[PDB]
Each structure stands twice: as C-alpha cells, then as structure tokens.
Amino acid sequence: TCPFYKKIPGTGFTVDAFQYGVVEGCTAYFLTHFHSDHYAGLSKHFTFPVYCSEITGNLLKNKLHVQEQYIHPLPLDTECIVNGVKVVLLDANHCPGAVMILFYLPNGTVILHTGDFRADPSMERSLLADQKVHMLYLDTTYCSPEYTFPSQQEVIRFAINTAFEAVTLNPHALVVCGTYSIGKEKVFLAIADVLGSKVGMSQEKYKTLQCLNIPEINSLITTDMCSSLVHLLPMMQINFKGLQSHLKKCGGKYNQILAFRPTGWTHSNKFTRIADVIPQTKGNISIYGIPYSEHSSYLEMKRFVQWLKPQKIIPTVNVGTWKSRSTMEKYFREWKLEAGY
C-alpha cells in the first residue's frame, strides 16, 4: 500500500507511486524522473494518466512502451491545469528530465515536491520566488553534516585533466566509464570532448541517450566501439576482472585502461580533497572513484530550506528507521531556529 509521503492532500494526485497497484482515489499519477526506484511498476499495460516532463515521456514511450494516449508531457516553468488544479514543473538539477512539482491547492495551500534534486542558488530565481510554500516534500538523501562533496564543475575538471594526461602519455590507453541509469552524462561526454573521440556504447544505452534532447548528441556518441577510445560499460563491470576481460575483447588495439566510477558520496570525502584523489591500480588497469553527486550536499540542502522557509517538511528519503527520522527532525528544527521562521 502507498505510503502517506507519496500522496498530495486535497487532490486526486500521487507522486512516484507506480508499484502499489490501483491507488484508491488517484486520478493522476505524477513521475518526477526516470529512475527505477521511482518508475517501478510502469509498462505498456498502464492505462491511467501519467504526468511528467517531455524527456521523461520520451523514455516512458521508448523504453517501457507506455502507450502515447496515457502520457501527458508538460512544459517547464509554465502554469498548467491538471484535473482542476494549477501545477508547475521546475528543473530539479538531478538527471535529464528530472522535475520538482509545485501544486496550488484549491484551498490556498501551496506544496513543493522536490522529487530527487541537487539544490542550487539558481532555484531562488525561478517561479519559487513569487509565493509562499506551506508544505515541502524534501529529498533528504544526504541530510547529515558529514556529507560534503565538491561542485560538479571541480569533479569534471579533475576527470578531464586526468584522462587527457593519461592518453597523451600513452596513446594506446583506453578510457572506460561506468553507468547503470540515466544521469551523470557530463562525465563521459566531457572526457570524449577533450580526447577528440565519440563515446562508444551498447545499442540499448545509445537508445536511452537518444531520448534525452541533448544538443548535438549524434556528434558525441556511437555504437561503433572500434572507432571510439572512450567506452561505456555497466557499473558492475568496473572492477579488475571485468576490465581485464574487456581489454581482451579490443584485439590488441589498447594496452592500458583508465576507468571511472562516478559514485555519490563515499567516506574518503571526509578526509581527502578532489585534488588529492588517487586510483586503485592492478597491472595496466587503474580505477578512479569520483564523487560526482546529483543530490544536494547537507549545506546546499540547508541553504535551500532556510531560503524557502516552509511551514512543514515531509522527508521522502531515509524514512524507514527511527534513528534517521529523529536525526532529520533535529536538523530541521536547528535550521528554523537559526533562520528565524
């Protein structure tokens, strides 16, 4: 059964609630983004209205075969009426097509559901600036002060400089980047751009990328692995055994692998700066774990909430243990006392 924190009071709406069968009283199902923990349950046999971004709707149609007549794509930054309720979709700074949803309830209450997001000051100048929000349904993935990580720009600088150095020293080195879902495309696209290569990948992953409206993409990606020196592999194959096996398949074109695993946070964040990151190495194979996050750090989250000043916060992540819930509630109270709302 659907949990309370996926239901929008005063409406017929749910958010990211496709794995519960027919939800009692639900007239429209919203989907914030195309990640499996959120879309779990959708298929060609779904016959209720799904409301989402254009990019998310491309992925539903092409990857899950949802029928077109039930996909309702909405433009961003635009007031729309859904089953008699005004809604706005805003960029979530997560993966491609990911949104936050503003609901303007018939009684005057305004609710923001962040979906999954990486808070940024640029959000303080969207349509959020223009009215008060009463309730916030918050992505609390990294809601603890130990969670610090660098900007995306510093992480990409590190990756480009690392790859360009390695391949310029050894033109027979292959670069490999791990993936298991959409998101974090800048990692492999920025590396291919500095090297003058396309990114090579499976037909299934090329298909997924072609649903994303990324400009000039036919220019950056390919299924011809032989023409590419940046390859994308499943995240599970980014280990010494999996990479040795891949290098065998390349027929003596290459004699070294430099591989990247974009994780979110790992505890080596509490001690080491991005500048100081080193790989794990075995023979002619090196593997870099890089802290490329598409969720808010603790400080970015705190700043957003202290700017927004909601009356009530409903966490959507880490809600299954009493220790996590108590921790989060304690930080929400601190933020409110420090800022004065």
Binding stretches for Ni ion (CB under 5 A): 35, 116
Shortest distance in whole angstroms from residue 15 CB to Ni ion: 13
Shortest distance in whole angstroms from residue 95 CB to Ni ion: 6
Token pair belonging to 140: 């609390």
Percent of residues in the chain assigned helix, strand, coil, to nearest 5 = 35, 20, 45
Token pair belonging to 46: 């779904």
Phi/psi at 64 (nearest 5 deg)? -100, -5
**Pairwise CA distance, residues 80 & 193, whole Å:** 38
Query: Which CB, 52 or 229, lies closer to Ni ion?
Result: 52
Query: Which CB, 35 or 246, lies closer to Ni ion?
Result: 35
Q: Is 290 helix (H, G, I), strand (E, B) or coil?
A: strand
Query: Which CB, 116 or 300, lies closer to Ni ion?
Result: 116
Decide: residue 206, CB within 10 A, 0-12 exposed, 13-18 middle, 19+ buried.
middle
Query: Which CB, 141 or 269, lies closer to Ni ion?
Result: 141
Q: Is 210 helix (H, G, I), strand (E, B) or coil?
A: helix
Query: Which CB, 183 or 200, lies closer to Ni ion?
Result: 183
Token pair belonging to 313: 């916060």
Shortest distance in whole angstroms from residue 35 CB to Ni ion: 4
Query: Which CB, 116 or 185, lies closer to Ni ion?
Result: 116
Shortest distance in whole angstroms from residue 261 CB to Ni ion: 17
Shortest distance in whole angstroms from residue 39 CB to Ni ion: 10
Query: Which CB, 63 or 309, lies closer to Ni ion?
Result: 63
**Pairwise CA distance, residues 287 & 165, whole Å:** 15
Shortest distance in whole angstroms from residue 94 CB to Ni ion: 6
DSSP lists the bridge partners of residue 290 as 262
**Pairwise CA distance, residues 98 & 91, whole Å:** 6
Shortest distance in whole angstroms from residue 212 CB to Ni ion: 15
Long-range contacts of 313-317 (CB under 8 A, 24+ apart): 313/136, 313/138, 314/5, 314/135, 314/136, 314/137, 314/138, 315/5, 315/138, 315/140, 315/143, 316/5, 316/113, 316/114, 316/137, 316/138, 316/139, 316/140, 317/139, 317/140, 317/141, 317/143
